[PDB]
Amino acid sequence: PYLVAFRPAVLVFFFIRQPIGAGLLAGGFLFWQADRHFNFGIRDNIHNFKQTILGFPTQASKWETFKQVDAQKRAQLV
Amino acid sequence: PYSNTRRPWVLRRHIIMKNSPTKWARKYSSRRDEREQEIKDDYIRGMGE
Amino acid sequence: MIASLAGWGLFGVTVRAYQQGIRKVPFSYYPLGYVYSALGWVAFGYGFNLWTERNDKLLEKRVEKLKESRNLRLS
Amino acid sequence: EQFHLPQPFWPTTKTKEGEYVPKDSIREASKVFIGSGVLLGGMHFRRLMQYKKGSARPGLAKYLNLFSLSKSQLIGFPVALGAFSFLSHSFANLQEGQTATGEFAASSIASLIGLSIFRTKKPLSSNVAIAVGMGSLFGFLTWAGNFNLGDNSYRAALEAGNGNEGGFDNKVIKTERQGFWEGVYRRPLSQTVEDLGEGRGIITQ
Amino acid sequence: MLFTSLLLIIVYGSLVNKSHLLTKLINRLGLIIIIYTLLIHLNINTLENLSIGINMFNNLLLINSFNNTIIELILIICILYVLLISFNITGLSIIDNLNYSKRTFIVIVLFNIIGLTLLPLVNDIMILFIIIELQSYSLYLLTAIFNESHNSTKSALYYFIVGSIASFIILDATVSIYDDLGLTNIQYILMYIDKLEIFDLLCLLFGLFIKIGLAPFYSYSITIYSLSPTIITNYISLMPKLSILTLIYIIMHYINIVNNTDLNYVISFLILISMFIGSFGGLNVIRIKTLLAYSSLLNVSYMLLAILSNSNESIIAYIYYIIQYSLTHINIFSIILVISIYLPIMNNMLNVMITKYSPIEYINQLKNLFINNIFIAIALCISIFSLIGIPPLTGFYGKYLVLISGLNNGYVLLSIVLIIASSISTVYYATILKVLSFDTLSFKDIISNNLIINTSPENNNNEIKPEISNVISYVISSLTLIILLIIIQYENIVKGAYLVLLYNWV
Amino acid sequence: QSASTLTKEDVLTRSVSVLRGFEVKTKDIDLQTTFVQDLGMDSLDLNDALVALEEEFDVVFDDKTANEIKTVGEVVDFVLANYLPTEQSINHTIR
Amino acid sequence: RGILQLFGPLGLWKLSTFISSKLNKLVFLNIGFILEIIVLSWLLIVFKVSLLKYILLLIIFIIL
Amino acid sequence: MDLILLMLVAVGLNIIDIYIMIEILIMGCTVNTIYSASLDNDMIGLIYSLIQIIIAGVESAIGLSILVNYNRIRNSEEIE
Amino acid sequence: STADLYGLISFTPKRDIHHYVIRVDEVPGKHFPTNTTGNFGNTVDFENLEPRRKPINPYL
Amino acid sequence: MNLEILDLSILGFYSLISSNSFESIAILVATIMPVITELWYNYSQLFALLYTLIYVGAVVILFVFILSVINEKEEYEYEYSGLFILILVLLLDDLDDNESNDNDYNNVYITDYADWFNNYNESDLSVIGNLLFTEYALLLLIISFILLMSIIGLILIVKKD
Ligand SMILES: CCCCCCCCCCCCCCCCCC(=O)OC[C@H](COP(=O)(O)OCCN)OC(=O)CCCCCCCCCCCCCCCCC
Ligand SMILES: CCCCCCCCCCCCCCCCCC(=O)OC[C@H](COP(=O)(O)OCCN)OC(=O)CCCCCCCCCCCCCCCCC
Numbered sequence A: 001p002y003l004v005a006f007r008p009a010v011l012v013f014f015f016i017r018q019p020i021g022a023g024l025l026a027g028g029f030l031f032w033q034a035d036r037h038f039n040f041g042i043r044d045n046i047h048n049f050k051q052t053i054l055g056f057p058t059q060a061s062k063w064e065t066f067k068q069v070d071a072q073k074r075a076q077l078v
Numbered sequence B: 001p002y003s004n005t006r007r008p009w010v011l012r013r014h015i016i017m018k019n020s021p022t023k024w025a026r027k028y029s030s031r032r033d034e035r036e037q038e039i040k041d042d043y044i045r046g047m048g049e
Numbered sequence C: 001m002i003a004s005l006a007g008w009g010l011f012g013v014t015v016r017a018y019q020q021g022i023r024k025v026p027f028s029y030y031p032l033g034y035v036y037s038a039l040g041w042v043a044f045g046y047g048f049n050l051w052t053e054r055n056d057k058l059l060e061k062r063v064e065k066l067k068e069s070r071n072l073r074l075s
Numbered sequence D: 001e002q003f004h005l006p007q008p009f010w011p012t013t014k015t016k017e018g019e020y021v022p023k024d025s026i027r028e029a030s031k032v033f034i035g036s037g038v039l040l041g042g043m044h045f046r047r048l049m050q051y052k053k054g055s056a057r058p059g060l061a062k063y064l065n066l067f068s069l070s071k072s073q074l075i076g077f078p079v080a081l082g083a084f085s086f087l088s089h090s091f092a093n094l095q096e097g098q099t100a101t102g103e104f105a106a107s108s109i110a111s112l113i114g115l116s117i118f119r120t121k122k123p124l125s126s127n128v129a130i131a132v133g134m135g136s137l138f139g140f141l142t143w144a145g146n147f148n149l150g151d152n153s154y155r156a157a158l159e160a161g162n163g164n165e166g167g168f169d170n171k172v173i174k175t176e177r178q179g180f181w182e183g184v185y186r187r188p189l190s191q192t193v194e195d196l197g198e199g200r201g202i203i204t205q
Numbered sequence E: 001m002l003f004t005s006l007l008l009i010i011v012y013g014s015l016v017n018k019s020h021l022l023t024k025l026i027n028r029l030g031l032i033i034i035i036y037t038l039l040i041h042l043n044i045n046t047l048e049n050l051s052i053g054i055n056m057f058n059n060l061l062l063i064n065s066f067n068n069t070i071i072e073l074i075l076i077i078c079i080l081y082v083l084l085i086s087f088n089i090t091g092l093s094i095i096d097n098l099n100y101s102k103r104t105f106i107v108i109v110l111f112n113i114i115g116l117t118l119l120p121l122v123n124d125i126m127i128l129f130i131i132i133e134l135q136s137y138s139l140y141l142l143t144a145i146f147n148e149s150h151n152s153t154k155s156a157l158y159y160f161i162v163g164s165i166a167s168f169i170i171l172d173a174t175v176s177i178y179d180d181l182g183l184t185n186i187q188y189i190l191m192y193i194d195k196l197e198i199f200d201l202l203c204l205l206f207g208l209f210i211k212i213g214l215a216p217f218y219s220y221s222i223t224i225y226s227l228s229p230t231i232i233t234n235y236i237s238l239m240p241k242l243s244i245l246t247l248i249y250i251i252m253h254y255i256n257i258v259n260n261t262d263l264n265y266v267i268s269f270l271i272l273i274s275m276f277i278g279s280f281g282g283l284n285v286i287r288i289k290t291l292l293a294y295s296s297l298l299n300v301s302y303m304l305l306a307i308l309s310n311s312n313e314s315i316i317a318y319i320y321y322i323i324q325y326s327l328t329h330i331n332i333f334s335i336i337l338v339i340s341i342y343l344p345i346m347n348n349m350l351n352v353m354i355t356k357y358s359p360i361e362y363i364n365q366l367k368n369l370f371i372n373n374i375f376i377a378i379a380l381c382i383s384i385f386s387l388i389g390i391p392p393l394t395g396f397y398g399k400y401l402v403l404i405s406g407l408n409n410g411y412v413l414l415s416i417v418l419i420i421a422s423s424i425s426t427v428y429y430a431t432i433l434k435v436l437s438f439d440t441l442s443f444k445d446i447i448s449n450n451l452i453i454n455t456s457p458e459n460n461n462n463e464i465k466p467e468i469s470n471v472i473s474y475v476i477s478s479l480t481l482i483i484l485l486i487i488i489q490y491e492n493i494v495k496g497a498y499l500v501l502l503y504n505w506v
Numbered sequence F: 001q002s003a004s005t006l007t008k009e010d011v012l013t014r015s016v017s018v019l020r021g022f023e024v025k026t027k028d029i030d031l032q033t034t035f036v037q038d039l040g041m042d043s044l045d046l047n048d049a050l051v052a053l054e055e056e057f058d059v060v061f062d063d064k065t066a067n068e069i070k071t072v073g074e075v076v077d078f079v080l081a082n083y084l085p086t087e088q089s090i091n092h093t094i095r
Numbered sequence G: 001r002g003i004l005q006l007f008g009p010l011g012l013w014k015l016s017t018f019i020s021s022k023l024n025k026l027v028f029l030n031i032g033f034i035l036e037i038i039v040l041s042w043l044l045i046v047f048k049v050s051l052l053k054y055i056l057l058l059i060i061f062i063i064l
Numbered sequence H: 001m002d003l004i005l006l007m008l009v010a011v012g013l014n015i016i017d018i019y020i021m022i023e024i025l026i027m028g029c030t031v032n033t034i035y036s037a038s039l040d041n042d043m044i045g046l047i048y049s050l051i052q053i054i055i056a057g058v059e060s061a062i063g064l065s066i067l068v069n070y071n072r073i074r075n076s077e078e079i080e
Numbered sequence I: 001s002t003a004d005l006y007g008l009i010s011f012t013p014k015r016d017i018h019h020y021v022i023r024v025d026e027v028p029g030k031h032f033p034t035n036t037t038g039n040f041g042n043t044v045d046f047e048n049l050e051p052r053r054k055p056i057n058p059y060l
Numbered sequence J: 001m002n003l004e005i006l007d008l009s010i011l012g013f014y015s016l017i018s019s020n021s022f023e024s025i026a027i028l029v030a031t032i033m034p035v036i037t038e039l040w041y042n043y044s045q046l047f048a049l050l051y052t053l054i055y056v057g058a059v060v061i062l063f064v065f066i067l068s069v070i071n072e073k074e075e076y077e078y079e080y081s082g083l084f085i086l087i088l089v090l091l092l093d094d095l096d097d098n099e100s101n102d103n104d105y106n107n108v109y110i111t112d113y114a115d116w117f118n119n120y121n122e123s124d125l126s127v128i129g130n131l132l133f134t135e136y137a138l139l140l141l142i143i144s145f146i147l148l149m150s151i152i153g154l155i156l157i158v159k160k161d
């Protein structure tokens, strides 16, 4: 629980000593929080790019498999 | 209560603590997730029988 | 079994005789060393023969099972 | 009639005609080329950071110099590996499978392409000498069955009944040829004529 | 017995006064402890009863006839090593007093023997991590026993750092498996052998490969073995391999159940590189211990081929090879410790500095051994020819049995490469023999009164004074004749290795 | 690491440059070049040069040698035989 | 005295000297060197096994 | 960023900085054990976590003593 | 005979995910340190346990 | 806003620019504190407190060794780095924080169902001790053995006598 007590102390001293390094680090931190909160989808699309290029089953890959089974099963009944 | 079951942030963001042979395999190697995706696909394929 | 233990004692004589050459002493120096060396390897030789006699008994019992296992395969 | 030469080749599974869907050579070479250039270039700029962090420590500097790559090696290595992957897959598609000759050609050409880039200040004949040596090693690697014979090993054959577990019997004669790891007491004389041919003591004199 | 007697020795060593004689006598008590440990272990553990595999201590440990043989081998080799610190190796105080100046030498050995013997028995991931730390920590403490030596401490720092990285890799592998399955016992994990990620066990093997000095992690072991005292290098270069390789065999026995050929290829890649480095690495070296470090790397590659093939022929190959290689390792280091007595003394170019820890440090310090002691020189030649693989020495059958298992499993490339590796490494094995003998005739009639042995006095000038002490001479004689004359009993010894089972049964 | 990397040509070359920055009669300095005659240094100038040559090579002349030095070549001989690199911290070497 | 020496003792001696000189530069006590090699080997776990022969070709390039 | 070994720049240029990296790396294993054990409601994982912490502290002391004696060896003249 | 004996000993029977040796003699969970009766998810009856797979001793 | 992300962002910045050995002994403490707090608030408060009890004692012993070995080397030395290369490196690192690629395991939330069968209700430390001192008592006694070896090991390394 000690980070809750120390965080105000470390953050202000971080801005005092290195205001530009702190603003850049804090600015990038807020930007990703805006991406998650406002559903910009920038971090998700990067994740979807990494999985596609590294051979992982993507979200679209798993949904394509379902659609292939769905069309296969329907014809099996019709 | 419904909650996520993700690993701690310090585990997946610390510059040093996130590096290990098995963590790199889990993050960059698709060998594990290819096998486990087969199990999930069998669930929907086997519905018709 | 005397013939086998005779060779083991003769191996122990060779071990002592080779040691004398290592230490650069005449091979007649301290003749009791050959008697000590001969008995030490007769003791090892007697235990060695018990080990090998046990091994042949165990090998036969395992081979009988292995032959039954092979007969099933050859069909 | 064809010459009857010995055929010292380890057993391999032979794909039936109509099988062997080919592998996309450009696509496979693209992954090797891009992935290698990213790593080699990325590890290069990672080591420059280690240089800047410390340059007054001889211990760190000595170790960094061993792993340091020149500019022509940072370009030549991905190109040689990419050409290798492309030519290995391209020749494999041509021959309906991978052969030691195909790997010898792919490795020597890939080596010579890379050597002419990051070994510019050496005689041309020197680069060809290394390329022939490099190509022979990979051709030997394929000839020996890569890292393991796999399903063509004797242990695999022994588990499939294609070994010699049951022994031999001369009364049994087989029209079809024996397995690679199988030995027999007596053979059809037609098989000997197929192997050796007639002549110097087979059938005729 | 080991644990109980260690506690008494720990307390007793701190009670009595400090003297070289008392430390030497305390070392002899350590010799008696290991002998009683062997007698007690033999009295209760037999190959026929342990064939099935018996669980102990809430299934934390699992002893079978394959594990039991290695435990007895470890105890026997540890007996031979303690004779070095419990008796005179040279007989001259300037050299021998080093082995008696550290009272905790025997205590650390008994600490490590416990870790060595328990490691092949591990049946749980929690106890696997605990024991591999117990073995590693004792090795670090033994590497630093001579704390007034700059090189000995520097080696222990290198050993600690590299061995801690490997341990973290080993721990990280077990944590990943526990995360996958939620299970800690090996036999429970075997029930899910088809569903856990098998490469999580390759990470476990990678940490074990670091601790045996396999390539590409060979650099630290070559450095450490050369910098450590010859008495320390004798132990640390052999003992960890007896236990870890046995554990690797058991792990690879479980891995082969699922038959993952991708995992077999990565290990084959490490074996191939280690053969290349082990053979070409030793060609341009001047230190004998650096040369033997590459020899160790090469012989480990040979054994790992038998471990990789992992069949019925592999049990016989690995068991026989590990026994005969340990004896050859013990025999060579025993001779190297002895023959420091034939070193010339000054009364200079290159400013060569020789220390008391490693009096024999360069290959050319073995010069004229054929003249100084022909019987010892031949004993060293027989051992070196065994490493070469000259039949009918023990080293020939080791390579022959390894090749059988390797070729039976389809490892055509590795079988050819090792035989090429054997030919390449023969070049630096022959260089030892060239130094020993090749200048015999052009130097036979020379006056050499400047040797270390000449500093010793004479008792009466009417007695016969042996030049080498009794115990160390008998051990060298015994091991050399075993290496030479193994053809007599080879058939009986290999029939015994047939009975050593690892869940073969039928 | 802890060994000299000095050659006779480098030590002479560095010695000449350090001696060139002084007020010497001639700039043509070789091994046989004497300090009193060729360069023209009195008691104090010579010891200024010796300390200057000390700082350049990180060596310290002993009192016996310094009082008895005559030629430039003697300095080059002294530096080659006595130079040692300074010990580094426990981290500079192993890391 | 020609090609059978190049493909023989004299040729292999030059090859051995070149290779052994490279390997002698890789044995030195340095924490950073062995840590880099240990971490580099982790890529064998990450990489798919089909890439082994490309790593083998890359390693022979580095020998040069 | 991990595959280009970015962690090699984050480790400091002293021998003690290597010790800290080892402690942090091992601490990553324990956090992963605690996380899995808590989700599964399994006390065997927490017993494992406790063992890792004690053992990791043992090697920290053993490594420190080696580094302590290494520094003493350099300061060996001790004419005082 | 020598050739026949080596053929028997050196043959390695195949292992897969369907047949291999697991050294567990009894089912766990008959007793717990506390709260042995949990969610009643332990459906194994230790009063009527079927015989286990006894290991084979080839020398017996 | 998960403020632990910002804390690790600052820590990664200071690990790249750290120069002397005192800053490294501060990176360690700057690492244990995020671990302790996150364990306290998410997974295990018992092990959050065990970390504090054990690691702090190790940290101070680590700090006191820095005093005896500090050797003037890195106060006056120079580093180059570059602010742009530091921040770009941290940006690329921050892009990929998915240690696992099972999207369903990372996205779909789960629950557990409570039951009243456990009427003997005690802390996790009592169960850990119950098993550690009864079933895994061998593990405890080996750990005691390893702690004894360290005591002997530290003396035979450091003590001149
Ligand atoms: C948003 C982007 C995120 C980027 C994340 C990755 C970080 C940058 C690292 C560069 C990429 C290399 C690593 C890629 C993942 C590891 C390799 C892999 O798993 O394969 C992925 C890639 C595509 O193969 P794919 O068929 O799609 O995967 C299987 C699908 N069933 O297979 C490949 O072709 C990858 C290329 C590998 C070939 C080059 C490497 C060999 C030459 C360099 C060797 C490096 C040093 C040697 C190390 C070993 C030393 C003993
Ligand atoms: C991404 C970083 C680079 C990748 C490094 C990979 C490290 C692990 C790979 C295994 C090799 C372990 C050997 C030790 C690692 C070498 C460390 C290193 O990379 O240093 C390079 C070294 C120095 O060479 P040098 O050119 O003088 O220095 C560069 C000057 N700017 O140059 C060398 O000498 C390296 C070669 C060492 C010998 C390895 C040979 C292994 C066997 C390969 C051939 C296999 C034989 C069978 C062939 C038949 C099959 C085709």
Ligand SMILES: CCCCCCCCCCCCCCCCCC(=O)OC[C@H](COP(=O)(O)OCCN)OC(=O)CCCCCCCCCCCCCCCCC
Pocket (backbone or CB within 6 Å): D130, E275, E276, E277, E279, E417, E420, E421, E424, G006, G007, G008, G011, G012, G014, G015, G018, G019, G060, G063, G064
């Ligand atoms: C009928 C008899 C049959 C028996 C003969 C069998 C041997 C045949 C092999 C012959 C090839 C070796 C003979 C020629 C090699 C000469 C080496 C050489 O001269 O160095 C070349 C170069 C260094 O340049 P440098 O020598 O200084 O000057 C150039 C002179 N024109 O440096 C180089 O370019 C050398 C190339 C770098 C090393 C490549 C390593 C590749 C892998 C190792 C090859 C062996 C693989 C063994 C694998 C298992 C090992 C355990």
Ligand SMILES: CCCCCCCCCCCCCCCCCC(=O)OC[C@H](COP(=O)(O)OCCN)OC(=O)CCCCCCCCCCCCCCCCC
Pocket (backbone or CB within 6 Å): A006, A009, A010, A011, A013, A014, A017, A018, J007, J008, J010, J011, J014, J015, J018, J019, J022, J023, J024, J026, J027, J029, J030, J031, J033
């Ligand atoms: C109650 C709050 C206490 C902390 C408030 C002060 C905030 C400063 C940073 C605290 C920790 C944040 C992460 C820093 C890790 C250590 C890296 C470091 O070297 O310290 C940073 C400090 C700033 O020095 P600076 O001039 O900016 O950089 C060097 C320029 N050549 O260089 C220094 O050496 C000064 C360090 C002073 C001693 C700090 C000891 C560590 C205390 C950490 C407790 C909190 C745990 C971390 C919580 C934040 C996580 C990021």
Ligand SMILES: CCCCCCCCCCCC(=O)OC[C@H](COP(=O)(O)OCC[N+](C)(C)C)OC(=O)CCCCCCCCCCC
Pocket (backbone or CB within 6 Å): C003, C004, C005, C006, C007, C008, C009, C010, C011, C014, C017, C018, C045, E481, E482, E485, E486, E488, E489, E491, E493
């Ligand atoms: C300066 C001297 C130079 C060299 C001179 C050579 C002299 C040779 C003397 C031989 C004496 C002799 O004849 O020994 C023979 C005896 C008795 O044999 P058995 O019990 O009937 O076994 C039957 C033998 N078969 C199978 C050939 C029929 O066995 C021995 O003792 C064996 C010798 C020991 C060799 C070491 C291996 C065994 C130990 C196992 C530990 C792993």
Ligand SMILES: CCCCCCCCCCCC(=O)OC[C@H](COP(=O)(O)OCC[N+](C)(C)C)OC(=O)CCCCCCCCCCC
Pocket (backbone or CB within 6 Å): C030, C032, C033, C034, C036, C037, C039, C040, C041, C043, C044, E470, E474
């Ligand atoms: C039950 C069977 C064994 C029975 C005997 C075993 C114990 C012998 C002890 C007797 C006392 C003694 O050794 O006395 C010491 C003697 C003499 O030493 P020296 O070098 O001549 O010194 C000179 C002595 N002066 C100055 C008095 C002349 O040494 C010996 O003779 C050495 C022979 C040792 C035999 C070891 C056998 C090992 C077998 C290993 C199998 C694995």
Ligand SMILES: CCCCCCCCCCCC(=O)OC[C@H](COP(=O)(O)OCC[N+](C)(C)C)OC(=O)CCCCCCCCCCC
Pocket (backbone or CB within 6 Å): E420, E423, E424, E427, G008, G009, G010, G012, G013, G014, G016
């Ligand atoms: C496989 C088909 C059959 C081949 C049989 C084996 C022949 C091997 C070549 C002879 C080497 C020799 O004899 O090594 C002896 C030679 C002696 O060289 P030197 O004359 O003193 O010149 C050298 C000194 N100089 C130039 C200054 C005058 O040491 C060497 O060069 C050292 C290199 C050893 C490499 C050995 C590898 C063997 C691999 C074999 C399989 C490829």
